[PDB]
Amino acid sequence: GSDGPIIEFFNPNGVMHYG
Numbered sequence: 001g002s003d004g005p006i007i008e009f010f011n012p013n014g015v016m017h018y019g
Contacts, residue, residue: 001016001017001018005017005019
C-alpha cells in the first residue's frame with residue numbers, strides 16, 4: 001500500500017508495506 005508495519009502479501013500494485 002505505502003509503508004506500513006506489515007508487507008503487502010495480497011498481490012498489491014507494486015512492492016511496499018501497508019497497514
